[PDB]
Scaffold this active site. Structure first.
Site, mmCIF file in Angstrom:
data_model
loop_
_atom_site.group_PDB
_atom_site.id
_atom_site.type_symbol
_atom_site.label_atom_id
_atom_site.label_comp_id
_atom_site.label_asym_id
_atom_site.label_seq_id
_atom_site.Cartn_x
_atom_site.Cartn_y
_atom_site.Cartn_z
ATOM 1 N N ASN A 189 -2.537 13.251 -3.463
ATOM 2 C CA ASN A 189 -3.394 13.808 -4.630
ATOM 3 C C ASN A 189 -4.141 15.148 -4.102
ATOM 4 O OD1 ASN A 189 -3.859 11.843 -7.094
ATOM 5 N ND2 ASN A 189 -3.633 10.621 -5.227
ATOM 6 N N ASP A 208 0.791 -1.307 0.052
ATOM 7 C CA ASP A 208 0.152 -0.081 -0.030
ATOM 8 C C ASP A 208 0.966 1.262 -0.013
ATOM 9 O OD1 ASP A 208 -2.781 1.567 0.615
ATOM 10 O OD2 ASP A 208 -1.407 2.124 2.266
ATOM 11 N N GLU A 224 -4.274 2.063 -4.959
ATOM 12 C CA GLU A 224 -3.335 2.335 -4.347
ATOM 13 C C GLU A 224 -2.513 1.025 -3.618
ATOM 14 O OE1 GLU A 224 -5.232 4.887 -1.527
ATOM 15 O OE2 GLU A 224 -4.058 4.015 -0.037
ATOM 16 N N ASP A 251 -0.757 10.321 -10.215
ATOM 17 C CA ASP A 251 -0.492 9.158 -11.222
ATOM 18 C C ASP A 251 0.767 8.785 -11.240
ATOM 19 O OD1 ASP A 251 -3.197 8.878 -11.629
ATOM 20 O OD2 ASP A 251 -3.395 9.868 -13.496
HETATM 21 N N1 LIG Z 1 -10.766 3.954 -11.603
HETATM 22 C C1 LIG Z 1 -10.575 5.281 -11.189
HETATM 23 N N2 LIG Z 1 -11.274 5.564 -10.161
HETATM 24 C C2 LIG Z 1 -11.007 6.766 -9.511
HETATM 25 C C3 LIG Z 1 -9.827 7.539 -10.062
HETATM 26 N N3 LIG Z 1 -9.789 8.937 -9.464
HETATM 27 C C4 LIG Z 1 -10.920 8.497 -8.627
HETATM 28 N N4 LIG Z 1 -11.740 7.643 -8.680
HETATM 29 C C5 LIG Z 1 -12.663 7.066 -7.935
HETATM 30 O O1 LIG Z 1 -13.326 8.020 -7.071
HETATM 31 C C6 LIG Z 1 -13.039 8.226 -5.893
HETATM 32 C C7 LIG Z 1 -12.850 9.670 -5.288
HETATM 33 O O2 LIG Z 1 -11.705 9.706 -5.665
HETATM 34 P P1 LIG Z 1 -10.755 11.055 -4.969
HETATM 35 O O3 LIG Z 1 -11.763 12.056 -4.264
HETATM 36 O O4 LIG Z 1 -9.883 11.837 -6.137
HETATM 37 O O5 LIG Z 1 -9.970 10.618 -4.023
HETATM 38 C C8 LIG Z 1 -9.245 9.346 -4.546
HETATM 39 C C9 LIG Z 1 -7.759 9.589 -5.069
HETATM 40 O O6 LIG Z 1 -7.191 10.749 -4.331
HETATM 41 C C10 LIG Z 1 -7.057 8.531 -4.767
HETATM 42 N N5 LIG Z 1 -6.947 7.720 -5.955
HETATM 43 C C11 LIG Z 1 -7.785 6.502 -6.288
HETATM 44 N N6 LIG Z 1 -7.337 6.030 -7.605
HETATM 45 C C12 LIG Z 1 -6.765 6.847 -7.840
HETATM 46 C C13 LIG Z 1 -5.838 7.012 -9.045
HETATM 47 O O7 LIG Z 1 -6.170 5.861 -10.166
HETATM 48 N N7 LIG Z 1 -5.276 7.942 -9.542
HETATM 49 C C14 LIG Z 1 -4.897 8.951 -8.712
HETATM 50 N N8 LIG Z 1 -4.029 10.049 -8.999
HETATM 51 N N9 LIG Z 1 -5.393 9.010 -7.452
HETATM 52 C C15 LIG Z 1 -6.350 8.063 -7.043
HETATM 53 O O8 LIG Z 1 -7.337 7.760 -3.582
HETATM 54 C C16 LIG Z 1 -8.557 8.539 -3.217
HETATM 55 C C17 LIG Z 1 -9.600 7.407 -2.648
HETATM 56 O O9 LIG Z 1 -10.008 6.800 -3.928
HETATM 57 P P2 LIG Z 1 -11.291 5.546 -3.647
HETATM 58 O O10 LIG Z 1 -11.420 5.126 -2.300
HETATM 59 O O11 LIG Z 1 -10.552 4.718 -4.624
HETATM 60 O O12 LIG Z 1 -12.278 6.236 -4.399
HETATM 61 C C18 LIG Z 1 -12.163 7.147 -5.689
HETATM 62 C C19 LIG Z 1 -12.329 6.160 -6.796
HETATM 63 O O13 LIG Z 1 -13.765 5.404 -6.397
HETATM 64 C C20 LIG Z 1 -9.153 7.015 -11.322
HETATM 65 O O14 LIG Z 1 -8.080 7.677 -11.779
HETATM 66 N N10 LIG Z 1 -9.509 5.853 -11.638
#
Ligand SMILES: Nc1nc2c(ncn2[C@@H]2O[C@@H]3COP(=O)(O)O[C@H]4[C@@H](O)[C@H](n5cnc6c(=O)[nH]c(N)nc65)O[C@@H]4COP(=O)(O)O[C@H]3[C@H]2O)c(=O)[nH]1
Ligand SMILES: Nc1nc2c(ncn2[C@@H]2O[C@@H]3COP(=O)(O)O[C@H]4[C@@H](O)[C@H](n5cnc6c(=O)[nH]c(N)nc65)O[C@@H]4COP(=O)(O)O[C@H]3[C@H]2O)c(=O)[nH]1
Ligand SMILES: Nc1nc2c(ncn2[C@@H]2O[C@@H]3COP(=O)(O)O[C@H]4[C@@H](O)[C@H](n5cnc6c(=O)[nH]c(N)nc65)O[C@@H]4COP(=O)(O)O[C@H]3[C@H]2O)c(=O)[nH]1
Ligand SMILES: Nc1nc2c(ncn2[C@@H]2O[C@@H]3COP(=O)(O)O[C@H]4[C@@H](O)[C@H](n5cnc6c(=O)[nH]c(N)nc65)O[C@@H]4COP(=O)(O)O[C@H]3[C@H]2O)c(=O)[nH]1
Ligand SMILES: Nc1nc2c(ncn2[C@@H]2O[C@@H]3COP(=O)(O)O[C@H]4[C@@H](O)[C@H](n5cnc6c(=O)[nH]c(N)nc65)O[C@@H]4COP(=O)(O)O[C@H]3[C@H]2O)c(=O)[nH]1
Lengths: 171, 176
Positions: B57, B49, B92, B66
């Site tokens: 972010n 993790d 993550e 990313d």
């Molecule tokens: N498939 C996909 N889904 C996305 C992406 N960005 C956001 N989400 C979805 O939207 C939720 C809210 O994301 P957040 O507020 O940006 O807050 C997110 C964000 O800050 C980070 N995160 C999760 N996935 C990604 C990712 O693929 N790229 C980046 N840069 N950050 C991510 O973790 C936090 C918690 O995320 P979760 O509990 O998974 O819950 C995430 C996930 O369900 C993405 O690029 N791809």
């Protein structure tokens, strides 16, 4: 030791937020020198976290790619589209009437929701994907950040209207 | 507005990193577990993790987030040549299969990954600002003789929570 393009988004290959912000300032300063118009739209994938809870993060990535594709096919220059946040897109429409921008956004929302996507692994139906939208015309003295705030406020109006809809800030 | 001709990409892979994805990993885990039962061989499972990842972010934006996913994934992929198997497991989280390897080798390897991830300080491509140190937390389990893939994953995840509660930036063996 070749680096990837630092101004694009990895999942979609559209511009990223910072490239959009630099392009927005330039486009606003240029519409202000030449007395020409410019419209800014902001789009959000509806219920996007829901997709990731139901189907997994990999499928969420494919919904982003799906919607980014629809947007990109209709953002040929002088239009400019970007992946603006995790689930948000933004577009610049220079020298276009506000009703043309509305028709383009209404065409994006019909296209996105027009077929039932399936999970690659299992072939299950994902449910329809809709999209909410807000746009604004730049006012005479107005900076990119200010017109971006009026467009975001319209996106919020679209979300509060019940999503799957377009809203002009000027309404 | 029909676009030019393209082919579906490999749907068993992850877009951001091109490691395997969760669903490919889950099937590969069940397969590798069955092979270890009928072969009487050993197999270990780690889960990792990225620490403080939403904070990243929030502080630097989704794009920078990313880049950290790709950096940590590249560290993991260097040490995951077959028969080892790595996957982007969740937003993550990463997961790795170590078929026919002793728990001692997995412990040493996760400790190597942990040190490598933290070894240099990344700068943003766009503004050259220092992101700071990136750490990972890590849990692993050795498969018990009758055990299904799911129960191994459950034990490895519980080790991962042990690491997070331990203060993060550490490795915990499930056998504690
Ligand atoms: N498939 C996909 N889904 C996305 C992406 N960005 C956001 N989400 C979805 O939207 C939720 C809210 O994301 P957040 O507020 O940006 O807050 C997110 C964000 O800050 C980070 N995160 C999760 N996935 C990604 C990712 O693929 N790229 C980046 N840069 N950050 C991510 O973790 C936090 C918690 O995320 P979760 O509990 O998974 O819950 C995430 C996930 O369900 C993405 O690029 N791809
Ligand atoms: N546009 C471009 N510029 C390049 C490239 N390779 C090197 N440079 C430039 O050369 C500087 C020194 O690179 P280095 O000696 O490998 O020294 C690098 C390297 O040791 C490490 N590093 C940075 N990025 C990466 C990476 O993506 N992968 C790996 N493995 N190491 C990296 O951080 C050091 C500092 O990097 P910077 O401060 O960015 O400073 C970099 C960068 O400004 C390239 O492929 N494209
Ligand atoms: N020696 C040296 N090699 C370089 C440099 N820049 C790029 N490379 C090589 O080119 C590959 C592609 O880097 P990328 O496209 O920026 O893709 C990178 C980037 O998205 C992210 N990443 C890695 N290090 C850094 C960093 O220091 N800062 C940021 N912002 N991102 C990084 O992880 C991805 C994978 O990194 P690698 O597996 O290292 O793979 C890197 C690395 O092998 C450099 O300055 N010095
Ligand atoms: N007519 C047709 N064309 C196909 C088919 N499979 C792949 N393609 C073409 O290959 C491109 C790349 O597909 P991808 O890598 O899955 O990349 C896709 C995928 O990640 C996501 N996506 C689109 N449709 C679906 C779907 O029905 N289910 C899922 N899970 N993802 C989808 O959006 C990305 C962009 O999709 P497109 O812009 O449509 O771009 C697609 C499309 O032009 C097919 O079965 N029929
Ligand atoms: N690996 C691979 N297989 C391909 C490709 N193109 C077509 N196929 C296979 O052919 C079937 C029918 O393709 P279709 O007539 O485009 O019929 C497709 C198409 O209308 C639509 N569709 C699915 N994925 C995409 C996509 O990514 N983009 C677009 N535009 N349409 C898609 O859904 C229908 C059902 O798709 P499936 O159940 O997946 O069933 C698909 C899939 O099994 C490809 O590029 N790569």
């Amino acid at each position: 030791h070749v680096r990837r393009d630092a101004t694009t988004d990895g999942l979609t290959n559209l511009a990223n937020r910072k490239a959009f912000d630099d392009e927005l300032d330039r486009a606003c300063a240029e519409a202000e020198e030449g007395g020409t118009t410019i419209c800014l739209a902001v789009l959000d994938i509806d219920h996007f976290k829901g997709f990731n809870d139901t189907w997994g993060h990999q499928t969420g990535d494919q919904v982003i790619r799906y919607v980014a594709s629809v947007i990109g096919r209709v953002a040929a220059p002088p239009r400019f589209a970007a992946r603006y946040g995790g689930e948000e897109f933004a577009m610049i429409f220079p020298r276009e009437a506000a009703s043309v921008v509305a028709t383009t956004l209404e065409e994006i929302r019909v296209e996105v929701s027009s077929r039932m996507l399936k999970r690659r692994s299992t072939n299950e139906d994902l449910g329809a994907i809709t999209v909410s939208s807000g746009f604004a015309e730049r006012k005479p003295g107005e900076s990119g950040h200010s017109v971006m705030e009026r467009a975001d406020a319209a996106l919020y109006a679209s979300k509060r209207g019940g999503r799957n809809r377009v809203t002009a800030a000027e309404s």
